[PDB]
């Protein structure tokens, strides 16, 4: 419970943050869950479209919001099938969430740079031949 | 300027978001800048410690903050060496920024799950043999 489930989730969230190339018995238990993780996500290629847009992970949402949802999963009752789901869903949320929060951060910071150029540096950049000049110098290497 | 620098940054920010394995003439110009990007970051292994802690990318900072810094780079005046820097620095900021903003999001969401277990599911999970039971069933595959 304390540091057995905590350790489970961490593993599953990692493996799932792997699979779709991004950053990041017992050990037996972990693998066994991975497989059922894939076996379920495979069977349901509904692009998990449900949340691939809905919650998307509100920038600093509330656990009560999360809990409020999952409850629906488990409404009827509880079984293992319904549990891997919880897991599979958890990752799918962690994947979007990040992938969708990373692309924006990058954007934000991308703007910041492009701007700083067109505003301060294009003047000077232009007065000196331009990017053709750069490449004339810094091209091929330093040597 | 408009869609020439914009296109430059995007490329450099991408290549730099590559290098350190994460998500994501002219074409000549892009490569030439990449190299000088590496050649500079190589020469200065100061872990770019300067910002690997300072600005770290405040959760929703202000461009005026950014601009306020870079200005210091360019204070004395302007040259190409000082420009790749601006670029190199830009990426280094984009790398931390994300890498540091991703690890947290993951955390936040990791907690949420581990909790939901110890709170709602450990009761039921325990009453049924436990994770040893899971693996008894969902182990090896479905077949």
mmCIF file of C-alpha atoms in Angstrom:
data_model
loop_
_atom_site.group_PDB
_atom_site.id
_atom_site.type_symbol
_atom_site.label_atom_id
_atom_site.label_comp_id
_atom_site.label_asym_id
_atom_site.label_seq_id
_atom_site.Cartn_x
_atom_site.Cartn_y
_atom_site.Cartn_z
ATOM 1 C CA UNK A 1 0.000 0.000 0.000
ATOM 2 C CA UNK A 2 2.408 2.706 1.221
ATOM 3 C CA UNK A 3 5.551 1.996 -0.815
ATOM 4 C CA UNK A 4 4.357 -0.944 -2.909
ATOM 5 C CA UNK A 5 1.631 0.726 -4.934
ATOM 6 C CA UNK A 6 3.559 3.972 -4.978
ATOM 7 C CA UNK A 7 6.345 1.904 -6.489
ATOM 8 C CA UNK A 8 3.914 0.275 -8.902
ATOM 9 C CA UNK A 9 2.512 3.450 -10.352
ATOM 10 C CA UNK A 10 5.945 5.011 -10.707
ATOM 11 C CA UNK A 11 7.018 1.985 -12.738
ATOM 12 C CA UNK A 12 3.877 1.914 -14.914
ATOM 13 C CA UNK A 13 3.946 5.668 -15.470
ATOM 14 C CA UNK A 14 7.560 5.392 -16.489
ATOM 15 C CA UNK A 15 7.198 2.429 -18.866
ATOM 16 C CA UNK A 16 4.218 4.227 -20.350
ATOM 17 C CA UNK A 17 6.251 7.464 -20.672
ATOM 18 C CA UNK A 18 8.770 5.299 -22.474
ATOM 19 C CA UNK A 19 6.682 3.358 -25.020
ATOM 20 C CA UNK A 20 5.735 6.639 -26.736
ATOM 21 C CA UNK A 21 9.314 7.960 -26.819
ATOM 22 C CA UNK A 22 9.596 10.855 -24.343
ATOM 23 C CA UNK A 23 11.613 11.738 -21.229
ATOM 24 C CA UNK A 24 11.295 10.425 -17.647
ATOM 25 C CA UNK A 25 7.382 -11.573 -6.490
ATOM 26 C CA UNK A 26 7.125 -7.757 -7.097
ATOM 27 C CA UNK A 27 9.378 -6.900 -10.007
ATOM 28 C CA UNK A 28 7.336 -9.767 -11.445
ATOM 29 C CA UNK A 29 4.163 -7.920 -10.530
ATOM 30 C CA UNK A 30 5.359 -4.835 -12.423
ATOM 31 C CA UNK A 31 5.852 -6.673 -15.734
ATOM 32 C CA UNK A 32 2.607 -8.589 -15.383
ATOM 33 C CA UNK A 33 0.853 -5.199 -15.080
ATOM 34 C CA UNK A 34 2.714 -3.770 -18.066
ATOM 35 C CA UNK A 35 1.484 -6.519 -20.301
ATOM 36 C CA UNK A 36 -2.148 -6.132 -19.154
ATOM 37 C CA UNK A 37 -1.470 -2.455 -19.671
ATOM 38 C CA UNK A 38 -0.703 -3.022 -23.319
ATOM 39 C CA UNK A 39 -3.248 -5.785 -23.826
ATOM 40 C CA UNK A 40 -5.988 -3.302 -22.748
ATOM 41 C CA UNK A 41 -4.757 -0.253 -24.595
ATOM 42 C CA UNK A 42 -4.422 -2.471 -27.649
ATOM 43 C CA UNK A 43 -7.970 -3.832 -27.469
ATOM 44 C CA UNK A 44 -9.323 -0.268 -27.160
ATOM 45 C CA UNK A 45 -7.911 1.855 -29.948
ATOM 46 C CA UNK A 46 -10.606 4.434 -29.325
ATOM 47 C CA UNK A 47 -7.568 6.731 -29.339
ATOM 48 C CA UNK A 48 -8.693 7.096 -25.743
ATOM 49 C CA UNK A 49 -10.214 10.038 -27.654
ATOM 50 C CA UNK A 50 -12.407 10.499 -24.584
ATOM 51 C CA UNK A 51 -9.655 12.390 -22.695
ATOM 52 C CA UNK A 52 -7.358 13.142 -25.618
ATOM 53 C CA UNK A 53 -9.300 16.409 -25.460
ATOM 54 C CA UNK A 54 -11.580 16.612 -22.367
ATOM 55 C CA UNK A 55 -9.507 16.966 -19.170
ATOM 56 C CA UNK A 56 -6.183 17.168 -21.114
ATOM 57 C CA UNK A 57 -4.755 17.920 -17.654
ATOM 58 C CA UNK A 58 -5.908 21.412 -16.666
ATOM 59 C CA UNK A 59 -2.814 23.551 -15.888
ATOM 60 C CA UNK A 60 -2.878 22.849 -12.156
ATOM 61 C CA UNK A 61 -6.177 20.975 -11.825
ATOM 62 C CA UNK A 62 -7.693 19.489 -8.678
ATOM 63 C CA UNK A 63 -7.377 15.915 -7.425
ATOM 64 C CA UNK A 64 -11.054 16.076 -6.527
ATOM 65 C CA UNK A 65 -11.609 16.495 -10.271
ATOM 66 C CA UNK A 66 -9.514 13.408 -11.014
ATOM 67 C CA UNK A 67 -11.072 11.341 -8.216
ATOM 68 C CA UNK A 68 -14.481 12.478 -9.423
ATOM 69 C CA UNK A 69 -13.841 10.795 -12.776
ATOM 70 C CA UNK A 70 -12.174 7.520 -11.876
ATOM 71 C CA UNK A 71 -15.088 6.995 -9.484
ATOM 72 C CA UNK A 72 -17.215 6.533 -12.603
ATOM 73 C CA UNK A 73 -14.916 3.782 -13.788
ATOM 74 C CA UNK A 74 -15.407 1.947 -10.491
ATOM 75 C CA UNK A 75 -19.068 2.893 -9.927
ATOM 76 C CA UNK A 76 -20.611 -0.569 -10.540
ATOM 77 C CA UNK A 77 -17.998 -2.165 -8.275
ATOM 78 C CA UNK A 78 -14.403 -3.455 -8.551
ATOM 79 C CA UNK A 79 -12.466 -6.127 -10.446
ATOM 80 C CA UNK A 80 -8.967 -6.478 -11.919
ATOM 81 C CA UNK A 81 -10.103 -5.651 -15.416
ATOM 82 C CA UNK A 82 -11.419 -2.381 -14.025
ATOM 83 C CA UNK A 83 -8.089 -1.895 -12.257
ATOM 84 C CA UNK A 84 -5.679 -2.192 -15.152
ATOM 85 C CA UNK A 85 -8.037 0.276 -16.841
ATOM 86 C CA UNK A 86 -7.481 2.757 -14.028
ATOM 87 C CA UNK A 87 -3.770 2.259 -14.700
ATOM 88 C CA UNK A 88 -4.021 2.398 -18.510
ATOM 89 C CA UNK A 89 -6.157 5.471 -18.199
ATOM 90 C CA UNK A 90 -3.659 6.962 -15.749
ATOM 91 C CA UNK A 91 -0.808 6.718 -18.201
ATOM 92 C CA UNK A 92 -2.828 7.885 -21.186
ATOM 93 C CA UNK A 93 -3.548 10.914 -19.067
ATOM 94 C CA UNK A 94 0.099 11.317 -18.119
ATOM 95 C CA UNK A 95 1.136 11.029 -21.763
ATOM 96 C CA UNK A 96 -1.237 13.622 -23.216
ATOM 97 C CA UNK A 97 -0.908 15.893 -20.187
ATOM 98 C CA UNK A 98 2.860 16.115 -20.649
ATOM 99 C CA UNK A 99 3.100 15.888 -24.469
ATOM 100 C CA UNK A 100 0.488 18.643 -24.522
ATOM 101 C CA UNK A 101 2.199 20.710 -21.790
ATOM 102 C CA UNK A 102 5.620 20.375 -23.294
ATOM 103 C CA UNK A 103 4.702 21.499 -26.799
ATOM 104 C CA UNK A 104 3.302 24.694 -25.347
ATOM 105 C CA UNK A 105 6.264 25.530 -23.086
ATOM 106 C CA UNK A 106 8.491 25.079 -26.117
ATOM 107 C CA UNK A 107 6.191 27.373 -28.095
ATOM 108 C CA UNK A 108 6.146 30.069 -25.423
ATOM 109 C CA UNK A 109 9.934 30.042 -25.263
ATOM 110 C CA UNK A 110 10.255 29.738 -29.057
ATOM 111 C CA UNK A 111 8.298 32.927 -29.513
ATOM 112 C CA UNK A 112 10.432 34.735 -26.986
ATOM 113 C CA UNK A 113 13.556 34.052 -29.044
ATOM 114 C CA UNK A 114 12.284 34.678 -32.573
ATOM 115 C CA UNK A 115 10.959 37.967 -31.244
ATOM 116 C CA UNK A 116 14.164 39.057 -29.575
ATOM 117 C CA UNK A 117 15.754 38.665 -32.981
ATOM 118 C CA UNK A 118 13.354 40.495 -35.289
ATOM 119 C CA UNK A 119 13.383 43.202 -32.613
ATOM 120 C CA UNK A 120 17.000 43.631 -31.549
ATOM 121 C CA UNK A 121 19.165 41.500 -33.770
ATOM 122 C CA UNK A 122 17.772 41.537 -37.347
ATOM 123 C CA UNK A 123 18.946 45.158 -37.667
ATOM 124 C CA UNK A 124 22.594 44.159 -37.007
ATOM 125 C CA UNK A 125 22.271 40.737 -38.554
ATOM 126 C CA UNK A 126 21.202 42.421 -41.827
ATOM 127 C CA UNK A 127 23.844 45.118 -41.861
ATOM 128 C CA UNK A 128 26.546 42.418 -42.003
ATOM 129 C CA UNK A 129 25.826 40.426 -45.152
ATOM 130 C CA UNK A 130 23.406 38.269 -43.206
ATOM 131 C CA UNK A 131 23.177 34.559 -42.497
ATOM 132 C CA UNK A 132 25.205 33.992 -45.643
ATOM 133 C CA UNK A 133 27.969 35.788 -43.833
ATOM 134 C CA UNK A 134 27.634 33.605 -40.730
ATOM 135 C CA UNK A 135 27.949 30.424 -42.719
ATOM 136 C CA UNK A 136 30.951 31.941 -44.544
ATOM 137 C CA UNK A 137 32.700 32.112 -41.213
ATOM 138 C CA UNK A 138 31.221 29.542 -38.834
ATOM 139 C CA UNK A 139 30.748 26.932 -41.562
ATOM 140 C CA UNK A 140 32.470 23.554 -41.754
ATOM 141 C CA UNK A 141 33.968 23.957 -38.302
ATOM 142 C CA UNK A 142 36.469 25.927 -36.237
ATOM 143 C CA UNK A 143 39.689 24.063 -37.051
ATOM 144 C CA UNK B 1 13.341 38.096 -40.271
ATOM 145 C CA UNK B 2 9.632 37.174 -40.236
ATOM 146 C CA UNK B 3 9.680 33.509 -41.281
ATOM 147 C CA UNK B 4 13.424 32.955 -41.647
ATOM 148 C CA UNK B 5 14.544 33.486 -38.072
ATOM 149 C CA UNK B 6 11.315 32.023 -36.772
ATOM 150 C CA UNK B 7 12.244 28.998 -38.848
ATOM 151 C CA UNK B 8 15.794 29.095 -37.515
ATOM 152 C CA UNK B 9 14.911 29.052 -33.859
ATOM 153 C CA UNK B 10 12.336 26.314 -34.333
ATOM 154 C CA UNK B 11 15.032 24.174 -35.940
ATOM 155 C CA UNK B 12 17.679 24.923 -33.287
ATOM 156 C CA UNK B 13 15.227 24.435 -30.431
ATOM 157 C CA UNK B 14 14.224 21.131 -31.932
ATOM 158 C CA UNK B 15 17.732 19.782 -32.592
ATOM 159 C CA UNK B 16 18.607 20.870 -29.075
ATOM 160 C CA UNK B 17 15.475 19.139 -27.693
ATOM 161 C CA UNK B 18 16.749 16.106 -29.553
ATOM 162 C CA UNK B 19 20.427 15.867 -28.542
ATOM 163 C CA UNK B 20 19.386 15.310 -24.907
ATOM 164 C CA UNK B 21 16.778 12.659 -25.760
ATOM 165 C CA UNK B 22 13.306 14.136 -25.158
ATOM 166 C CA UNK B 23 10.135 14.835 -27.157
ATOM 167 C CA UNK B 24 9.416 17.570 -29.738
ATOM 168 C CA UNK B 25 21.447 28.440 -48.733
ATOM 169 C CA UNK B 26 19.132 28.150 -45.642
ATOM 170 C CA UNK B 27 18.919 24.497 -44.702
ATOM 171 C CA UNK B 28 22.680 25.007 -44.924
ATOM 172 C CA UNK B 29 22.396 27.899 -42.501
ATOM 173 C CA UNK B 30 20.567 25.681 -39.998
ATOM 174 C CA UNK B 31 23.333 23.052 -39.832
ATOM 175 C CA UNK B 32 26.075 25.658 -39.698
ATOM 176 C CA UNK B 33 24.317 27.082 -36.609
ATOM 177 C CA UNK B 34 23.917 23.650 -35.034
ATOM 178 C CA UNK B 35 27.612 23.021 -35.178
ATOM 179 C CA UNK B 36 28.478 26.425 -33.656
ATOM 180 C CA UNK B 37 25.772 25.527 -31.181
ATOM 181 C CA UNK B 38 27.664 22.449 -30.100
ATOM 182 C CA UNK B 39 31.118 23.967 -30.471
ATOM 183 C CA UNK B 40 30.088 26.651 -27.909
ATOM 184 C CA UNK B 41 28.245 24.441 -25.471
ATOM 185 C CA UNK B 42 31.228 22.110 -25.621
ATOM 186 C CA UNK B 43 33.802 24.807 -24.860
ATOM 187 C CA UNK B 44 31.725 25.945 -21.858
ATOM 188 C CA UNK B 45 30.940 22.963 -19.674
ATOM 189 C CA UNK B 46 30.049 25.299 -16.836
ATOM 190 C CA UNK B 47 26.960 23.071 -16.773
ATOM 191 C CA UNK B 48 25.410 26.373 -17.787
ATOM 192 C CA UNK B 49 24.985 26.098 -13.997
ATOM 193 C CA UNK B 50 24.139 29.802 -14.134
ATOM 194 C CA UNK B 51 20.514 29.108 -15.180
ATOM 195 C CA UNK B 52 20.363 25.415 -14.329
ATOM 196 C CA UNK B 53 18.855 26.876 -11.156
ATOM 197 C CA UNK B 54 18.226 30.661 -11.440
ATOM 198 C CA UNK B 55 15.366 31.385 -13.877
ATOM 199 C CA UNK B 56 14.627 27.641 -14.428
ATOM 200 C CA UNK B 57 11.654 29.006 -16.398
ATOM 201 C CA UNK B 58 9.189 30.473 -13.893
ATOM 202 C CA UNK B 59 5.786 28.757 -14.372
ATOM 203 C CA UNK B 60 4.431 31.405 -16.734
ATOM 204 C CA UNK B 61 7.178 34.035 -16.534
ATOM 205 C CA UNK B 62 7.373 37.332 -18.404
ATOM 206 C CA UNK B 63 9.160 38.024 -21.687
ATOM 207 C CA UNK B 64 10.336 41.291 -20.171
ATOM 208 C CA UNK B 65 12.195 39.084 -17.686
ATOM 209 C CA UNK B 66 13.797 37.105 -20.512
ATOM 210 C CA UNK B 67 14.606 40.197 -22.588
ATOM 211 C CA UNK B 68 16.020 41.796 -19.454
ATOM 212 C CA UNK B 69 18.625 39.030 -19.235
ATOM 213 C CA UNK B 70 19.733 38.501 -22.813
ATOM 214 C CA UNK B 71 20.284 42.266 -22.923
ATOM 215 C CA UNK B 72 23.207 41.637 -20.572
ATOM 216 C CA UNK B 73 24.694 39.198 -23.042
ATOM 217 C CA UNK B 74 24.576 41.866 -25.753
ATOM 218 C CA UNK B 75 25.350 44.879 -23.529
ATOM 219 C CA UNK B 76 28.884 45.611 -24.839
ATOM 220 C CA UNK B 77 27.643 45.327 -28.427
ATOM 221 C CA UNK B 78 27.003 42.567 -31.004
ATOM 222 C CA UNK B 79 28.965 39.895 -32.873
ATOM 223 C CA UNK B 80 28.301 36.360 -34.137
ATOM 224 C CA UNK B 81 30.018 34.737 -31.201
ATOM 225 C CA UNK B 82 27.585 36.604 -28.974
ATOM 226 C CA UNK B 83 24.758 35.430 -31.226
ATOM 227 C CA UNK B 84 25.293 31.689 -31.175
ATOM 228 C CA UNK B 85 25.495 32.178 -27.403
ATOM 229 C CA UNK B 86 22.019 33.697 -27.399
ATOM 230 C CA UNK B 87 20.955 30.568 -29.282
ATOM 231 C CA UNK B 88 22.905 28.100 -27.111
ATOM 232 C CA UNK B 89 21.552 29.810 -24.054
ATOM 233 C CA UNK B 90 18.050 29.694 -25.536
ATOM 234 C CA UNK B 91 18.114 25.943 -25.897
ATOM 235 C CA UNK B 92 19.746 25.307 -22.539
ATOM 236 C CA UNK B 93 16.836 27.254 -21.152
ATOM 237 C CA UNK B 94 14.333 25.284 -23.205
ATOM 238 C CA UNK B 95 15.893 22.011 -22.069
ATOM 239 C CA UNK B 96 15.893 22.673 -18.323
ATOM 240 C CA UNK B 97 12.568 24.508 -18.460
ATOM 241 C CA UNK B 98 10.851 21.473 -19.979
ATOM 242 C CA UNK B 99 12.836 18.651 -18.307
ATOM 243 C CA UNK B 100 12.122 20.455 -15.043
ATOM 244 C CA UNK B 101 8.438 21.092 -15.871
ATOM 245 C CA UNK B 102 7.816 17.591 -17.068
ATOM 246 C CA UNK B 103 9.219 15.802 -14.031
ATOM 247 C CA UNK B 104 6.850 17.774 -11.845
ATOM 248 C CA UNK B 105 3.696 17.201 -13.920
ATOM 249 C CA UNK B 106 4.498 13.500 -13.813
ATOM 250 C CA UNK B 107 4.943 13.749 -10.045
ATOM 251 C CA UNK B 108 1.671 15.600 -9.515
ATOM 252 C CA UNK B 109 -0.191 12.987 -11.534
ATOM 253 C CA UNK B 110 1.797 10.124 -9.970
ATOM 254 C CA UNK B 111 0.664 11.171 -6.530
ATOM 255 C CA UNK B 112 -2.930 11.365 -7.647
ATOM 256 C CA UNK B 113 -2.881 7.698 -8.653
ATOM 257 C CA UNK B 114 -0.939 6.154 -5.771
ATOM 258 C CA UNK B 115 -3.349 7.984 -3.494
ATOM 259 C CA UNK B 116 -6.502 6.823 -5.214
ATOM 260 C CA UNK B 117 -5.249 3.319 -4.551
ATOM 261 C CA UNK B 118 -4.256 3.417 -0.885
ATOM 262 C CA UNK B 119 -7.573 5.217 -0.387
ATOM 263 C CA UNK B 120 -10.139 3.348 -2.466
ATOM 264 C CA UNK B 121 -8.510 0.278 -3.908
ATOM 265 C CA UNK B 122 -6.063 -1.205 -1.349
ATOM 266 C CA UNK B 123 -9.063 -2.323 0.735
ATOM 267 C CA UNK B 124 -10.412 -4.474 -2.145
ATOM 268 C CA UNK B 125 -7.013 -5.269 -3.567
ATOM 269 C CA UNK B 126 -6.058 -6.797 -0.184
ATOM 270 C CA UNK B 127 -9.237 -8.758 0.368
ATOM 271 C CA UNK B 128 -8.506 -10.763 -2.804
ATOM 272 C CA UNK B 129 -5.136 -12.404 -2.214
ATOM 273 C CA UNK B 130 -3.420 -9.281 -3.480
ATOM 274 C CA UNK B 131 -1.001 -8.572 -6.302
ATOM 275 C CA UNK B 132 0.037 -12.209 -6.117
ATOM 276 C CA UNK B 133 -3.485 -12.965 -7.194
ATOM 277 C CA UNK B 134 -3.328 -10.538 -10.126
ATOM 278 C CA UNK B 135 -0.181 -12.102 -11.478
ATOM 279 C CA UNK B 136 -1.775 -15.550 -11.013
ATOM 280 C CA UNK B 137 -4.417 -14.497 -13.482
ATOM 281 C CA UNK B 138 -3.070 -11.745 -15.733
ATOM 282 C CA UNK B 139 0.414 -13.263 -15.913
ATOM 283 C CA UNK B 140 2.123 -14.588 -19.033
ATOM 284 C CA UNK B 141 -0.627 -13.274 -21.276
ATOM 285 C CA UNK B 142 -4.279 -13.667 -22.230
ATOM 286 C CA UNK B 143 -4.056 -16.522 -24.740
#
